[PDB]
Design a binder for this molecule. Structure first.
Ligand code: HEM
Length: 152
């Protein structure tokens, strides 16, 4: 678990992401794709995106970006109390999409890195350590729901 203090730090940065979701949304995804392009394969709609510039130009990617952050955000304001919110995503990932936990750690990486580039001064070690934990709590919870559904 995370302390109250840790949670506030997480939500304190979350607040800034919230000022430009679409924008934080696209950076995250561009970073993921770029750093681990094997993840692109889950996306057929994105398959065709050859450059950053085209990636940046897609409404579809930008939307997808917003859809990802809003879900993650609703989960974090739950401060660890997120089974209900969590459950649909674990189902879909265990059943439709088949996303490995590995894919999820990649994404965690892109998240942190974006936050740190955009928000240096609100994203110090304490905060960063706190966001790490929370993203870890999310992946862990996911991982077990997965097993329960027979995936991993
Ligand atoms: C912070 C982590 C993430 C969150 C909150 C998240 C959330 C979502 C949401 C809310 C959807 C739409 C409903 C559903 O199909 O579940 C979605 C769909 C999907 N997610 Fe994720 N996602 C995350 C990470 C990933 C990763 C890392 C991948 C694959 C590498 C991924 C692959 C997919 C795919 C392929 C779909 C189907 C979307 C479509 O084309 O209609 N998600 N994800």
């Amino acid at each position: 678990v995370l302390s109250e203090g840790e949670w506030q730090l997480v939500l304190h940065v979350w607040a800034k992401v919230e000022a430009d979701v679409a924008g934080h949304g696209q950076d995250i995804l561009i970073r993921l794709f770029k750093s681990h392009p094997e993840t692109l394969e889950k996306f057929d709609r994105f398959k065709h995106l050859k450059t950053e510039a085209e990636m940046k130009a897609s409404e579809d990617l930008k939307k997808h970006g917003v859809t990802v952050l809003t879900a993650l955000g609703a989960i974090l304001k739950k401060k660890g109390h997120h089974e209900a919110e969590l459950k649909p995503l674990a189902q879909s990932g265990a059943t439709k999409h088949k996303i490995p936990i590995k894919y999820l750690e990649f994404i965690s990486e892109a998240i942190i890195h974006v936050l740190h580039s955009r928000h240096p001064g609100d994203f110090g070690a304490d905060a960063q350590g706190a966001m790490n934990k929370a993203l870890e709590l999310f992946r862990k919870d996911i991982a077990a729901k997965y097993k329960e559904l027979g995936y991993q």
